[PDB]
Amino acid sequence: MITSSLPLTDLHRHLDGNIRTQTILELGQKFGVKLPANTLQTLTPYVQIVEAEPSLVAFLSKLDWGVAVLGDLDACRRVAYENVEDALNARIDYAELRFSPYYMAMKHSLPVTGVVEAVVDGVRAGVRDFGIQANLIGIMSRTFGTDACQQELDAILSQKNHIVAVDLAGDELGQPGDRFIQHFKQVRDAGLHVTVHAGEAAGPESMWQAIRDLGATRIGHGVKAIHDPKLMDYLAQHRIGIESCLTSNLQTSTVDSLATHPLKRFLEHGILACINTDDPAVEGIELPYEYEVAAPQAGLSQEQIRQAQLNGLELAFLSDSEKKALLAKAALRG
Amino acid sequence: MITSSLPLTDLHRHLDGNIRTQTILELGQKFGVKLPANTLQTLTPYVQIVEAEPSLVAFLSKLDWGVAVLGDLDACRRVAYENVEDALNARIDYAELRFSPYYMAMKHSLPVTGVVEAVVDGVRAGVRDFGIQANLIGIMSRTFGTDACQQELDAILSQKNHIVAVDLAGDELGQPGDRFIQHFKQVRDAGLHVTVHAGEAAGPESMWQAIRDLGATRIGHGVKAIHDPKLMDYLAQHRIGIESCLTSNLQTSTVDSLATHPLKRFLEHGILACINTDDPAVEGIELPYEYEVAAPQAGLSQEQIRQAQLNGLELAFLSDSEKKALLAKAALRG
Numbered sequence: 001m002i003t004s005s006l007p008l009t010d011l012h013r014h015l016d017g018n019i020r021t022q023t024i025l026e027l028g029q030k031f032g033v034k035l036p037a038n039t040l041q042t043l044t045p046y047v048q049i050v051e052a053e054p055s056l057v058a059f060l061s062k063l064d065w066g067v068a069v070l071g072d073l074d075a076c077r078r079v080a081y082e083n084v085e086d087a088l089n090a091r092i093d094y095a096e097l098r099f100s101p102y103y104m105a106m107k108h109s110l111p112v113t114g115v116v117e118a119v120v121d122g123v124r125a126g127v128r129d130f131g132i133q134a135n136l137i138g139i140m141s142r143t144f145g146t147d148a149c150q151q152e153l154d155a156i157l158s159q160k161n162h163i164v165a166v167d168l169a170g171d172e173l174g175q176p177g178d179r180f181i182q183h184f185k186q187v188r189d190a191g192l193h194v195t196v197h198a199g200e201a202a203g204p205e206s207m208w209q210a211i212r213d214l215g216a217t218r219i220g221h222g223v224k225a226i227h228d229p230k231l232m233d234y235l236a237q238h239r240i241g242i243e244s245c246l247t248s249n250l251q252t253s254t255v256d257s258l259a260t261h262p263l264k265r266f267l268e269h270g271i272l273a274c275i276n277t278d279d280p281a282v283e284g285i286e287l288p289y290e291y292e293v294a295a296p297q298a299g300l301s302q303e304q305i306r307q308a309q310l311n312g313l314e315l316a317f318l319s320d321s322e323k324k325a326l327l328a329k330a331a332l333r334g
Numbered sequence: 335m336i337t338s339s340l341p342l343t344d345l346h347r348h349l350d351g352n353i354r355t356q357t358i359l360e361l362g363q364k365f366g367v368k369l370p371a372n373t374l375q376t377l378t379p380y381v382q383i384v385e386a387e388p389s390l391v392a393f394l395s396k397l398d399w400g401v402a403v404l405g406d407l408d409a410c411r412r413v414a415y416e417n418v419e420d421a422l423n424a425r426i427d428y429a430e431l432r433f434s435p436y437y438m439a440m441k442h443s444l445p446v447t448g449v450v451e452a453v454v455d456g457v458r459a460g461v462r463d464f465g466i467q468a469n470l471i472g473i474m475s476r477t478f479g480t481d482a483c484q485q486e487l488d489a490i491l492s493q494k495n496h497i498v499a500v501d502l503a504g505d506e507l508g509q510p511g512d513r514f515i516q517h518f519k520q521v522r523d524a525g526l527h528v529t530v531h532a533g534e535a536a537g538p539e540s541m542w543q544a545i546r547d548l549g550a551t552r553i554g555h556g557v558k559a560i561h562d563p564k565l566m567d568y569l570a571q572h573r574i575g576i577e578s579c580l581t582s583n584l585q586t587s588t589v590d591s592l593a594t595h596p597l598k599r600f601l602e603h604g605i606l607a608c609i610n611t612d613d614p615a616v617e618g619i620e621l622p623y624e625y626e627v628a629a630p631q632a633g634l635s636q637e638q639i640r641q642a643q644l645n646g647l648e649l650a651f652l653s654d655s656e657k658k659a660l661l662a663k664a665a666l667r668g
């Protein structure tokens with residue numbers, strides 16, 4: 001259960017893996033994109049996980065129809081705006097929305113810098129209209145190779161005043177993190193924070209590399225650390241964040257069952273693990289369900305769920321002043 | 335792929351497991367039913383399978399919120415009507431819609447005979463407005479016991495001029511078929527056809543009991559027959575229909591993977607097996623997806639998928655005249 005008197009964060013939330021099916025249908029029709037189906041219920045299985053996919057890359061294909069309908073920059077602004085509304089309705093007080101502008105732009109060859117600007121505009125309008133707090137994380141989609149990721153990084157950095165961090169996401173096995181060392185040097189020299197998807201499809205060596213050579217202070221998933229006691233020791237004493245995504249790990253077959261998900265053992269090890277959605281529309285979940293159903297099925301007690309909620313606040317890419325303010329604001333509730 | 339020049343049937347399709355999430359929200363608000371969430375995206379994981387459930391009854395719990403909002407007889411009429419529109423939109427030419435009026439009625443204590451009449455009315459209005467062909471199958475929900483099922487059967491038979499068959503559905507292992515012998519004697523005495531959910535959670539012994547003691551000429555699922563070579567010979571020799579539900583069997587964990595689903599081996603044994611949805615809204619699928627994605631993943635060639643499509647026509651609870659007319663109507667398309 002969500003604790004009302006604590007801020008509720010979502011720190012690992014892909015806005016371009018969270019496109020409403022109704023929006024896919026409308027933009028698909030607006031741009032003449034031939035979709036596999038033409039009603040909400042018949043399109044649902046093509047844009048949403050039906051049962052667990054056998055791999056991370058099989059799961060990633062489910063996001064494709066959502067970005068296939070981004071026919072102009074206004075479409076990207078719309079999806080970004082709608083994502084702020086969805087975060088509000090999911091009870092989130094502070095959301096970090098991550099997005100890959102290269103991935104969003106590639107089906108209709110949109111200008112990647114234009115896509116970054118449109119997403120900034122859409123989230124800014126959404127924050128104004130819906131009243132939650134939000135920050136942006138730019139993703140380098142490793143899947144498309146280092147050259148595409150450099151083009152994507154250039155676009156992200158041109159709006160660095162509005163973006164708090166850069167992420168590495170996509171096909172972890174096919175494009176290991178040691179190919180992006182010089183990309184993340186540019187990220188840190190620009191003063192941005194670093195989170196990295198690691199230890200999901202690949203093993204603990206990917207997490208070590210992200211920590212040591214990419215400068216990650218948060219890791220997306222990180223579930224393979226359960227096999228590396230020294231790594232779990234390091235995560236705890238260096239306060240590296242673990243962005244846990246329970247349903248996502250099931251649906252990529254990264255974790256065979258919630259009963260064996262490592263989140264509970266991470267928390268028992270004093271690791272700063274937090275609870276997140278990942279790709280809510282693709283997965284068919286939202287944040288309250290992860291708290292109310294998934295986390296108890298992963299064996300967490302209510303005390304452990306509250307600890308994880310607090311960890312999300314501590315891990316946010318915010319100043320301590322802003323974290324203080326969020327805690328003090330939520331403490332008046334409940 | 336669906337074969338356009340062939341009739342498309344759905345013979346195993348629970349109307350009370352196919353209630354639109356938007357309709358759940360609207361009726362929930364109408365009748366003051368406190369739902370676990372209040373928007374489409376947040377309510378979805380509570381009314382739809384997220385990943386495979388560990389058991390049949392864990393899957394069945396996903397249906398509860400849809401029937402919890404059936405606050406009056408007109409709500410039942412509405413979801414029956416909306417079910418015909420959904421079948422039309424799923425490209426179905428002939429649907430057999432099955433429903434448990436006792437289950438629909440129990441949350442708000444509706445008159446069970448009233449629910450049956452409302453469902454007949456709604457499907458009749460839908461068949462008029464949407465133009466497909468449909469029949470009704472009344473379900474005894476074994477889950478609630480022999481007395482409840484007798485009351486349910488009485489209500490179904492009061493409309494037997496508008497219902498073609500009676501089914502047994504629910505918790506198969508908790509309420510075995512041998513408890514309902516007298517119920518299905520009444521079904522056959524009234525002249526109705528018999529289909530039985532069997533060989534899903536229990537073994538092939540349950541399928542034998544349905545055939546020999548309940549008089550079933552079609553079996554819902556029947557996936558455990560793959561372990562009984564004598565039963566497979568019998569199914570083929572006696573033309574006993576097998577109503578296959580690919581996604582459903584994954585989501586109940588009845589079958590470990592589509593590649594190991596028995597549908598392909600059934601067809602190769604000459605068994606009349608057909609492709610169906612089961613509970614499309616709960617599963618997050620629809621019939622074209624089963625044909626286009628699930629069936630190839632189950633290893634079927636296009637030739638076998640076509641044979642399964644023809645098998646659905648042959649297994650329909652229709653006269654040979656009506657089957658000929660369906661074939662003739664579809665033959666002009668493509």
Ligand SMILES: OC[C@H]1O[C@@H](n2cnc3c2N=CNC[C@H]3O)C[C@@H]1O
Pocket residue numbers: 014015016017056060063098099100103139140141142143169170171197200220248278279
């Ligand atoms: O935001 C879109 C980009 O992120 C990837 N992406 C989206 N969701 C995930 C991704 N990557 C890796 N792991 C699985 C899950 O956490 C796809 C695309 O490149």
Ligand SMILES: OC[C@H]1O[C@@H](n2cnc3c2N=CNC[C@H]3O)C[C@@H]1O
Pocket residue numbers: 348349350351390394397432433434437473474475476477503504505531534554582612613
């Ligand atoms: O029509 C609603 C009734 O049918 C049951 N029911 C609904 N879907 C299924 C059911 N039963 C058994 N097997 C799994 C799947 O095929 C639930 C309720 O009793």
Ligand code: NA
Pocket residue numbers: 048049050283284382383384617618
């Ligand atoms: Na779902």
Ligand SMILES: [Zn+2]
Pocket residue numbers: 012014169197220278
């Ligand atoms: Zn992610």
Ligand SMILES: [Zn+2]
Pocket residue numbers: 346348503531554612
């Ligand atoms: Zn069924």
